[PDB]
Design a protein around this ligand. Structure first.
Ligand SMILES: *[C@@H]1O[C@H](CO[C@@H]2O[C@@H](C)[C@@H](O)[C@@H](O)[C@@H]2O)[C@@H](O[C@@H]2O[C@H](CO)[C@@H](O)[C@H](O)[C@H]2NC(C)=O)[C@H](O)[C@H]1NC(C)=O
Length: 218
């Protein structure tokens, strides 16, 4: 997240960090005790059996007892198109079920097909790069963004910060976009580099995949 701010500790208990030996590489959202939702791009070229799903985290640089770590048991895809950057969503079934508490919670999803109008206010978040040249964040970052339909296709939910350069960046892919209390997007891709101030950030439109999601998590 470029130009954002540190989130209050555990302000978003549904926020997930996907990690590999080296550490954080993508975000995710807890949508049920044993299911997380992320971007298909995140697991396209990675050894799923090596991925660690970290719940209840805030500062990735410190050892946190509030954390709960799981492995990926199964993957559910929905037609991800790596060339056109479409259907960038995947559901990862965990090797166990999370203990729901103050630091680990299930997110609320929108109604199937619900679209967001131009002007909707959302909150983007993630442990991605802090700048168009700053590196991965230690403390979870959040950012106020506005939904825009221009310079965006109907197959995406896009957002833009006006009056300054800010937005999601590398490492934020798969992270949730919260709008009106519901997870309406999954960070997918940027254009013109991070926080260009020109191209809106693109997210997978969660609302379009609700019936699919529900068929899997019950
Ligand atoms: C910046 O964003 C915060 C948080 O956004 C809201 O909550 C998110 C979880 C998501 O649901 C978004 O769609 C929401 O817009 C805004 O904080 C709210 O501020 C109002 C007063 O302006 C207050 O009454 C609410 O309780 C706050 N909500 C929360 C959860 O903190 C804030 O207004 C935004 N600022 C700007 C200038 O956009």
């Amino acid at each position: 997240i470029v130009g954002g701010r540190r989130a209050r500790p555990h302000a978003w208990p549904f926020m997930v960090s996907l990690q590999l030996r080296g550490g954080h590489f993508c975000g995710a959202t807890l949508i049920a005790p044993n299911f997380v939702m992320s971007a298909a791009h995140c697991v396209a070229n990675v050894n799923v059996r090596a991925v660690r799903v970290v719940l209840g985290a805030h500062n990735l640089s410190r050892r946190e007892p509030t954390r709960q770590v799981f492995a990926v048991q199964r993957i559910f895809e929905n037609g991800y198109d790596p060339v056109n950057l479409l259907n960038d969503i995947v559901i990862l079934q965990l090797n166990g079920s999370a203990t729901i508490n103050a630091n680990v919670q299930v997110a609320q999803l929108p109604a199937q097909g619900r679209r967001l109008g131009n002007g909707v206010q959302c909150l983007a978040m993630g442990w991605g790069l802090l700048g168009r040249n700053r590196g991965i964040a230690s403390v979870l970052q959040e950012l106020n963004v506005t939904v825009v339909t221009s310079l965006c296709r109907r197959s995406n939910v896009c957002t833009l910060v006006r009056g300054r350069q800010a937005g999601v960046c590398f490492g934020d892919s798969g992270s949730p976009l919260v709008c009106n209390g519901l997870i309406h997007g999954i960070a997918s891709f940027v254009r013109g580099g991070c926080a260009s101030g020109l191209y809106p950030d693109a997210f997978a439109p969660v609302a379009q995949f609700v019936n699919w999601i529900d068929s899997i998590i019950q």
